[PDB]
Structures are given as C-alpha cells and as structure tokens.
Amino acid sequence: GTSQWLRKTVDSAAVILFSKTTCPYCKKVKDVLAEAKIKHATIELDQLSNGSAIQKCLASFSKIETVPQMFVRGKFIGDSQTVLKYYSNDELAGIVNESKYDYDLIVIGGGSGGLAAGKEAAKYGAKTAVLDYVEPTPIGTTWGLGGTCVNVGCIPKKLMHQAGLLSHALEDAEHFGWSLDRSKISHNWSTMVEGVQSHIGSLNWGYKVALRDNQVTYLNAKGRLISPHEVQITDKNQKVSTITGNKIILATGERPKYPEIPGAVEYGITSDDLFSLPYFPGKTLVIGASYVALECAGFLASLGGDVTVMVRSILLRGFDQQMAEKVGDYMENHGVKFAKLCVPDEIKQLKVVDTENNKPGLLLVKGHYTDGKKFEEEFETVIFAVGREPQLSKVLCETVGVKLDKNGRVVCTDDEQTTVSNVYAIGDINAGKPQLTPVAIQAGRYLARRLFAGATELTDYSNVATTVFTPLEYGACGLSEEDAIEKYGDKDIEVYHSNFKPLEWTVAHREDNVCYMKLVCRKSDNMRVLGLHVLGPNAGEITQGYAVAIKMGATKADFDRTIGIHPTCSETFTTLHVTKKSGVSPI
Amino acid sequence: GTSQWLRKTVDSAAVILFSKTTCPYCKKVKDVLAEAKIKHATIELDQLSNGSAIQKCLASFSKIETVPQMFVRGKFIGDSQTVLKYYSNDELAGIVNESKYDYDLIVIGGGSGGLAAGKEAAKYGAKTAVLDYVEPTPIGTTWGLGGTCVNVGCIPKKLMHQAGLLSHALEDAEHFGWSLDRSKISHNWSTMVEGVQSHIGSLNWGYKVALRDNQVTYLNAKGRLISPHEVQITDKNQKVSTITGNKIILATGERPKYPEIPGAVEYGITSDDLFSLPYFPGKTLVIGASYVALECAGFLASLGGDVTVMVRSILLRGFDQQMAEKVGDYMENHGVKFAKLCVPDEIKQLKVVDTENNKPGLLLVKGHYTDGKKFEEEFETVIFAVGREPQLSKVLCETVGVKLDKNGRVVCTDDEQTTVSNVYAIGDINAGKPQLTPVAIQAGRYLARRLFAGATELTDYSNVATTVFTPLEYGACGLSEEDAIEKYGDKDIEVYHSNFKPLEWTVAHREDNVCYMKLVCRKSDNMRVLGLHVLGPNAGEITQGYAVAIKMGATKADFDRTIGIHPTCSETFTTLHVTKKSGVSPI
Ligand SMILES: Cc1cc2nc3c(=O)[nH]c(=O)nc-3n(C[C@H](O)[C@H](O)[C@H](O)COP(=O)(O)OP(=O)(O)OC[C@H]3O[C@@H](n4cnc5c(N)ncnc54)[C@H](O)[C@@H]3O)c2cc1C
Ligand SMILES: Cc1cc2nc3c(=O)[nH]c(=O)nc-3n(C[C@H](O)[C@H](O)[C@H](O)COP(=O)(O)OP(=O)(O)OC[C@H]3O[C@@H](n4cnc5c(N)ncnc54)[C@H](O)[C@@H]3O)c2cc1C
Ligand SMILES: OCc1c[nH]c2ccccc12
Ligand SMILES: OCc1c[nH]c2ccccc12
Ligand SMILES: [K+]
Ligand SMILES: [K+]
Ligand SMILES: [K+]
Numbered sequence A, B: 001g002t003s004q005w006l007r008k009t010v011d012s013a014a015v016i017l018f019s020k021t022t023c024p025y026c027k028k029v030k031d032v033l034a035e036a037k038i039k040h041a042t043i044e045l046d047q048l049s050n051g052s053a054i055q056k057c058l059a060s061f062s063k064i065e066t067v068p069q070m071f072v073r074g075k076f077i078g079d080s081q082t083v084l085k086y087y088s089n090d091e092l093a094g095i096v097n098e099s100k101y102d103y104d105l106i107v108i109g110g111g112s113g114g115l116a117a118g119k120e121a122a123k124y125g126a127k128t129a130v131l132d133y134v135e136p137t138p139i140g141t142t143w144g145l146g147g148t149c150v151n152v153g154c155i156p157k158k159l160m161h162q163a164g165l166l167s168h169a170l171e172d173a174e175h176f177g178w179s180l181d182r183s184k185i186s187h188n189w190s191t192m193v194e195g196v197q198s199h200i201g202s203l204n205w206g207y208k209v210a211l212r213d214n215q216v217t218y219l220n221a222k223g224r225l226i227s228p229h230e231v232q233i234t235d236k237n238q239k240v241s242t243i244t245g246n247k248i249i250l251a252t253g254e255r256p257k258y259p260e261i262p263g264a265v266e267y268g269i270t271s272d273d274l275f276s277l278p279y280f281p282g283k284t285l286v287i288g289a290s291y292v293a294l295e296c297a298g299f300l301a302s303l304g305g306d307v308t309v310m311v312r313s314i315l316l317r318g319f320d321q322q323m324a325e326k327v328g329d330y331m332e333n334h335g336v337k338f339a340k341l342c343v344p345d346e347i348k349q350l351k352v353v354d355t356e357n358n359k360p361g362l363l364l365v366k367g368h369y370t371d372g373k374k375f376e377e378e379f380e381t382v383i384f385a386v387g388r389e390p391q392l393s394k395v396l397c398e399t400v401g402v403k404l405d406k407n408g409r410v411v412c413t414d415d416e417q418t419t420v421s422n423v424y425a426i427g428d429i430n431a432g433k434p435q436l437t438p439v440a441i442q443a444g445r446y447l448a449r450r451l452f453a454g455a456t457e458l459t460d461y462s463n464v465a466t467t468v469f470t471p472l473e474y475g476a477c478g479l480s481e482e483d484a485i486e487k488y489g490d491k492d493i494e495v496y497h498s499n500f501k502p503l504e505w506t507v508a509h510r511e512d513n514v515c516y517m518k519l520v521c522r523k524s525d526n527m528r529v530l531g532l533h534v535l536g537p538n539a540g541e542i543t544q545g546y547a548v549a550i551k552m553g554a555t556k557a558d559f560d561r562t563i564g565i566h567p568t569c570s571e572t573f574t575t576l577h578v579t580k581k582s583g584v585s586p587i
C-alpha cells in the first residue's frame, strides 16, 4: 500500500516537499522556503525503504519522477526551476496560501490535546485555528487558555498537594535538627492561591504568545461544527460567524458533574472553583471518591482543614482495590474523615458566602446511608467530585453525523477519526481512552503528523501509567490484581509484594509498614509483569521509568537482574521475593 | 554438562534434598526436616527440563534413581525410609552436623555483601560464620556491625543530605503559604547526629538479632585467611585462634585514603569520622572531588557551613563530565566554594579540638596550584575524600595464593571465585566491579545460592545505575556521552536532551534551566539508549525504573511510545526531541 500512503499523504498535507538528503536542487528549494518562512513537511525519499517506488508513483500526480517535487494541498506545484521562478516572481507566497477553506485545520478546544495538535500541525505548514472558550461555572468562575489540566486540574492540584506535603516537611525538619516549632506555624490559603494563580496566568499568557509566534490563529470563541467543514463561532460579544477548515479536531474535554439534587448547583462547588477560591473552604465535605475527590480532600486536610469525604460505595473505582483501601486508610489515619455508603439528598443554605471577606458560608447537608439511615451535618463548603462528562451536544449538531456513545463521547477508530472522514477527536472526549493530559498531548501531536507530514505512527493507549497525588501517593502501570485474576485465573497469577520505609521517614519517626509495592505477574508467560503498584512518596517519579520496561514486556526476571539504586524507595522493586501465595507477611 | 552441574551441586551443598513436587514420600521427608528445623536446599526434579537425566545420574552417588534423596556435604544419606529411621532414632541431628570443617562458610567481613551472603547461605543449611571487625580511625572512631554503607556511608550520608534538602523545603514553604520565616531558623548539628546515630544503632542491633535468629555465628573479630580453609581470628581481647571453613567469602571492603603529607592523619578527618562527629565541623575544607566529597560538601553547606572543595583536576572523574560540571555549577551557585587545580602540601594545627565542647579546632592548610602558586588558608575542619582502598594484606597471607591486582583488589572470575578454588570475593574488593551496596548484596546472595542451592545464575554487573546525592541530585545509567563517542564514533551517537523545571520549583521561585536530562543513543543500533542522565530532584527515584528498560535494551522509540505521568520530572524522558547535533538550545 505504498501508492495508497502516497495518495493519502499528498491529498492531506498542506505544503510538502519530496526530497533526497544528497540533492543540491532540493537544498535550493529548502533554502528558498526557509528564507520565505514557508513551513512545510519534507519526505526524504532516500531514507525510505520504498523510496524508489514512491518516486515513480509521484509521476501519477506530477508527470515527473525527479526530486524535488513540491505539493500544496494536493496540487503539484513544480520542480526546483518552477518553485524558484515562482519565488523570484513574488508569486510563491500566493500559491502556498491558496485553499478551498479558511484553514487546513480547525481545533475546537484549547486544552492539553488541542493546543498540542494545533502547534504540531502548524510546524508542517498547516494553516491552523485553535478555538477555546471556557463556559463559566454556576458561580461565575472562568479562566484563561490552556484547558483543564493547566487551569483547574493537574497543575493547580499538584501545587496544592505540594503545599500539603510541605506540612510534613516542616514536622520532619525538627527531627533532622532544624530549630522550627511546627505547632506554631499556620497556613494562609489566600497566599497559596495567589501563588498558584500567578503561575497559571504565566501559562495562559505563554500559550497565547506561543500560538502567535507559531502563526496559529487563536480565537477565544465557542465553536460549533454545523457541517463537516464549517465551524460556527460565537465570540464574547455574542457575534456569530462561520469559518471553514479542511480537517477538524474535536478536543473539547469535559466538565464536572453535579448530582440532580436541590441545592447542589446553587450552594456547592467543584474543582473548577476550588483552585481560585477567594476564601478558605473551612470545614469541607467532599462528595465523591474519585482521584480528584481524594486528592483535594488530602491537601485540604494537610493545610489544616476539617475534611470529610462522602463515599457512595468504594474508593477509586476502576483502580486496584487493595491499593485504594491503603490510600484511604492512610488518609483516615492522617485526619480525613469518611462518610461511608452514603449519598447526598439536598444542600440547604444557612449562611450566604461573604464576598467582603475571606469567609465561606454555611451549609446543611442531608443525605442517607444505603440502609436508609439519615445523614445530616453542617459544613462551610461542599465540593462535588462525582465525575466529569463531555459537553458535546452544545458543540455538535446531530446533523453532522459524528457518532457518540451512550455517555456522550466520540466513537473513533484507532487513528482518532470520527464517523465523518475529515473530523477527528482527541483527549478526554475520545471514547474508551485513558483520560490523562499526556495521552491527549501524544494523540494530538501524533495525529497532526499523520495529517500533515505523512506519518503513520499511531498512539498506543495500552499500559498507560497513572499517579494519584493523595497525601501518600499511589502510582500504577498496567493491570490491577483483580483484573489480572479475572482475565487469567488465580492459578496463573503470582503477586510479589513488600512493605517498605523511606529512609527519610526513619529519623522523622514516620510509619514503618504503610508504604507498599507489588508486582502482579503471569506465571504461564514467563512471569510477565502485568501490573506494577506503589504506595509511597514520589510515586510518580518511581513509576514512570518502569512504564517503559512494561511497554517492552518486562518479566519478573528483568526486574530481578537489574541492580537497585541505594538508598531509594524505588530499588525495592528489584529485590521482591515474598509472594502472596506463600502467606508470608510483607512487613 | 548436566552431570557436571550435579557433581558440583552435590559436592558443595551442605544439606540438599532431591525431590518432586508431587511426591508423598518427599513430603514426608520435608515435613520431618521442617519439624527438626533442619534447613536445606531442595531441587524439584519435575521442574527441571533435564530432571529425568539428573534423576538417573544421582545413582552414581547413591545407587538409586528414586526420590527423595538426601545428601549432606556430598554424602548420600538415604531415601525416605532411611532418613525417617534416622530421625526416629534421634540420629539425624548428628548426621546433618557432621563436617570436616567448623563451618560450611566463613564470611570475612560483616558489611553489605558479607551479611547478605551469610544470611542467604544459612537459609540452605550452610553452617555459617560472619566475622566483622572495624579497625578504628586515627582519632579512634569505631562503630557496630553492618559495614560502610550502614555506619559511615550511604545511610548516614543520605540522612544528612535529607537534613540539607529540608533547608530548601523551609524556604519553599513560605511561598506555598506557610507562616514560617526561614531566616530565623537555624540548624543544630548535634541534634541531627544524635538522630542519625540512633537509627544506625537500630541497624547494628538488628543485624546481630537477625544473625542469631538465622543461626549464623557472629564473631566480632578480625579474620586472616592463613590457608585455603583456615581463618585465624583475633578478638577484642587479642586472643588468637583458628576456625576452619569449607567455603570462604572475602567481603572486607575498603577504607578512606589519606594523602602522604604532614598533618593529614593527625589533624584531618574522613567520612569515617564525619557521621558521628561530636562537634559541628565549622568552616570546612573538603579535599577531593569524588561523589563522597561533593555529597558531604553539599549537605554541610545546606546546613549553614562555610565549605570549600579542593579539586586536583576534575569533578566526578569517571562520570559524564557535562553532568559533573552542571553538578558543580549548581553547588557553586548555592554556596560551595571550589579551589581548582589545587592540591594540599601540609596541614598544621593552630588549635586542638576542644573535647569539653562542641567546637572544632583550627587548622592551617598549605597547598599549591598546578602553576606552582601557593594556597594558604585557615579552616576549622579538613575532610579528606580522595578515594578509598582495600586493606587486604592485613587479611591475606601471600602464602595462600589469592591473586590481587596492582590496586590490591581481588582478581575474580565471573562467578566471584578467586585463584583459590574454595575462596570467593564480593563487594568493593572484587576487582573491576562497580563499588555499590546493591551490587555487593546481589553478588553475595547469588553466590550463596550457587554454592549451597545448586543455582547457576550469575550477577550481571553491566549498566548498573548510580545516583550522586549532591544538593541537586545526579542519576545515571549506562555510558557517559564521551565514552559512547569514544567507543562508537561521534557520527554514530545521537544525544537527545532538555532542561526542565520541577513544577514544585515554580511557586517556589527556583531556577528554570538548571535541571537537565539527556539520552545518549546509538544510531546504527536502532537508536539504542546507551546512557541515561538526569540532574534534578529525586534523581534516584527517577532513574531506577529506566535501568530495567536499559537492561532490556530500550531504544529511543521505546521511550517515545511510552506515555508520561503528569505532572512529574521523569515524564520529560518520554518526549525528548532536541538533538545536540541540531544545535537547538535545550532551554
Ligand atoms: C482536578 C482535576 C485534576 C486532574 N489531575 C490530573 C493529573 O494529575 N495527571 C493527569 O495526567 N491528568 C489529570 N487530570 C485530567 C486532565 O486534565 C485531562 O485529561 C486533560 O486536561 C484533558 O485534555 P483535553 O484536551 O481532552 O481537554 P481540556 O484540557 O479540558 O480542554 C478542552 C478545552 O476546550 C474548551 N471547550 C469546550 N467546549 C468548547 C467549545 N465548543 N468551543 C471552544 N472551546 C471549548 C474547554 O473549555 C477547554 O478549555 C485532572 C482533571 C481534573 C478535573
Ligand atoms: C561516604 C560513603 C558514601 C557512600 N554512599 C553510597 C550510596 O549512596 N549508594 C551506594 O550504592 N553505595 C554508596 N557507598 C559505597 C558502599 O558503602 C559500598 O559499596 C558498600 O558498603 C560495600 O559493601 P562491602 O560488603 O564490599 O564492604 P563494607 O560494607 O565496607 O564491609 C566490609 C566489612 O568488613 C570489615 N573488615 C575489614 N577487614 C576485616 C577483617 N580482616 N576481618 C573482619 N572484618 C573486616 C570492615 O570493617 C567492614 O565492616 C558509599 C561509601 C562511602 C564511604
Ligand atoms: O477509612 C477509609 C477507607 C478505607 N477504605 C475505604 C472504602 C470506602 C470508604 C472509605 C474507606
Ligand atoms: O565551579 C564549580 C565547578 C564546575 N566545574 C568544575 C570542575 C573542577 C573544579 C570545580 C568546578
Ligand atoms: K505526551
Ligand atoms: K536485583
Ligand atoms: K541488591
């Protein structure tokens, strides 16, 4: 399918040069395009095994089999003499800008995936527009360019986690000889939020600058795809217009869910509001048991808050439940309270938020446990963290023919194509994929290369590592133990595990058998590592490197033959020997 | 060579049972041995591909081809009826203890390797003695069981590093909203040392307990091997005696070097003294440029010391020199001074150490630079960190025939055997091997299994990862860039690199382009990762996991197809794209 790849590549690339590495006439064209600041893809036919067949197949477009050959939006433009003559006639600029559509690419959504896709496409000469609009929360919260992670997700959340971890650092410093008295040190919410928000603002501004500098058109407008190639945009003045694009990337992400109960929208908040909140939440109820819920509860408690988590059923559904239980046990032993088997029925307002002060209001939460008994307690802040959902019917006229699943997410092939041939979807709205910022970035960058640089590489969505930034962090890569046993049977699963104590916790008088790690392995496949799990400090740094080895098919023997780095937490993965089957305690 | 393996296994195992998994008569013997608390190796012939050939070859020792078959020190003891009859006659205990020698194994040296080897051997029924003696430093410093890492190496050093890192944690906490004022907080050396030493003491005691509980004989005595099977021991009362052992493991480690200059031994100290020093060093000169020198200088400076490092030529000789320079640049920008191209000539004493106080003395250091100009400056403490050396002529009568190299280290085959067939060497004294605690532990455990459990697996000494715990930590696995270019040529090496900023450093107002990572790759071998290098926080946790992937032969494509964990430092390894060849700035 060499000819098939060539046709697809020529038809979708915006500006593409077919070249050879050792070709003085190709260098002449490259240098001209560089001086003219015309961005383009380049295919060096000498570095392709099928380069000779591609060179001959080009004649079916251009009539010639020589290099260089320049194409614009599927049209052969010329050889070296022709391109250079156009340039000398000041005609090349017009030719490279000729298009049926306003843009080669319209990205709807300026978050993790969309920005990554748009920037990468422009690198290859695609005339690109990135649309971003932030629908305000119920209380009016909005923010700048960059998406969920940047503004109300990974970035602020990990920063506030770090604020929380520094609590323990202050306690520990005494034991290591520093003269501070932790009991006399307090935390100021407003100071922290100001610092977090100043960094977010530098990211908002940096994205706008980068797009300008990369010749990407940024529109702060809500986009609606009204036909395969037409995007209706509404700007902040409510002015409505239509732009057209050849390729469309949907990258609109999700927003928090609210339960359908009285008072939820009016009196509660979500993570969208928390990270810029202009008052300390105070006594807080977090409703939900997702990683978002536990991460937020964890740092609120470490910053001195009185924190309760209301749990409908289990913690961290979809994660290894042994690990989820250890995560919650640690939180409960460090000052987080849990209302178990419990759901809210209504939020009543007892005091309105005092805008002229850094004070929360006061709320009455009524709920009930699964056995029917009543929950009733006052809180100053109620945070809903019960999941996130796409928002697409506000972005997709059903007329267009982009298929959604029962959850409202876009149904895509393994190259991110929707059911409309020129429309693609990336990030959290792509059904069935891990909903993680680096996934969206990789999917968007790799898709842009396929569209505009003739690349073929797909995103690999398997064994994507995670880290939950709870007070004691939880990193994982691969299968949970229970999923492994379900798939292969208990007799084919061997689990090696161990507690451990960070050296840093020894002089600090922290707990000896709370950190924990395990390898879930498949006996019949040479003890293949199906899943790695670690509860401990710096769990994301620990886990990341092993995700490469698991991607490569690491076995238990691969871990064993590797030598540890001492003293680290991570080295314990290289000497695991206690199996769950053996019954020997992991302590 | 199945018969050859069997002969070797039978001759060297102390107590070994040849069995099958599904064998009720073997279970009868196993249960008896368990009740009698007779430890032994077990070879399940059904789990060996050549099990049928081994079962037949056993008859050449025992006259029978059935299982179970029990051997003690090369002697066939009996089948199930015979072993059970011995047990019922209360004769089995005597038979299993019969030996030509006092011990199956004498370990000379109770450090990382030796303790690991001795404990593992005893698991298989080897009657084991572990000898440990700590020759005092020039000023009289000594310590307990456990070796260099435990007492005067990795453990105390990383603990004091952590004390130093907490300095930055206190600074950072303010920016994250905590009310402390770092400028009013000071550090107390004695409090820290007391905490470090209390942990070390728990390790000393724990090793003694473990050896007792594992039936290993601990002798706090200096051992000298006077013939292949005889060890002369001198206890702390100077009483001299001789014990005999079948196998001997030399695991005696190294001690710091002193330069041959007036005043060095009398007035300087080394790392052996630093970690229990009963006074703060004060204004300190560290002579040397090893990882030990830089690690100690780094935490002394972070704990408020006035610190100078005297460097003969380069930093971290043998490490990637681009990385070593970045390590030193960071130290110099954070309050460590460097006396470059400089060597000491003599240390003169100006004030004697005041034992009735926590005060150092005062010293005059005279030296000279390579151009002949004079160095002369006063310091309160001078720490020599100019390398470590073995001490074996005090442990090895040349009579015995154990070959040493020009540096005094033991010349070993790839199974740790010396030139004397029953004598092995592990850890730092084994010539040519990485001198690291986890290496010594793995070598010792794996050797014990080969000696006493019929194992065949060797220690793999290639691509052993390291981490230097300087104030900004430096982790590496594999080749330095310069070694890669020397081995394969510059045109075959591609280096991908990037600066990065820990998210934790953003709100804290730390430096934007100081952390750095690179992958040194081989073009002609599918961009194989020859070396990984990272300068940043938690560098050991970052690096460890990748050492498995490198062990498995990771390529650049393996890193690229892996998805990052966000937000971490380590994830930057999964998106590297800037090559050194390209000339594009890594910032
Ligand atoms: C509290 C929280 C914490 C998280 N922590 C982590 C973590 O630690 N590690 C990790 O990997 N992931 C984390 N995530 C998930 C991560 O943020 C998402 O996976 C990532 O942001 C998804 O990127 P995206 O491009 O799909 O969508 P988004 O980043 O959400 O961007 C979509 C953009 O498009 C906008 N938009 C929507 N509709 C339109 C429209 N019609 N027109 C124009 N613009 C529109 C949206 O307002 C938004 O700005 C967290 C999420 C949350 C809520
Ligand atoms: C300051 C310093 C910091 C270090 N930091 C790290 C780090 O961060 N990570 C890492 O991996 N490695 C580190 N190391 C190296 C590590 O400590 C050594 O590689 C490890 O301890 C070697 O183990 P070993 O068994 O060979 O010898 P040792 O641990 O030194 O034990 C040998 C024992 O045998 C004793 N002995 C000597 N002669 C006799 C005799 N005749 N009879 C009886 N006993 C005898 C010795 O006194 C000693 O107790 C560090 C070393 C130093 C000095
Ligand atoms: O106590 C904390 C905790 C551990 N496991 C849990 C499961 C559901 C709700 C709370 C917990
Ligand atoms: O300034 C610190 C430093 C960076 N590189 C070095 C090499 C030799 C001696 C000191 C340094
Ligand atoms: K990515
Ligand atoms: K190992
Ligand atoms: K080891």
Ligand SMILES: [K+]
Binding pocket: A442, B559, B560, B561, B562, B563, B564, B574, B575
């Ligand atoms: K990647």
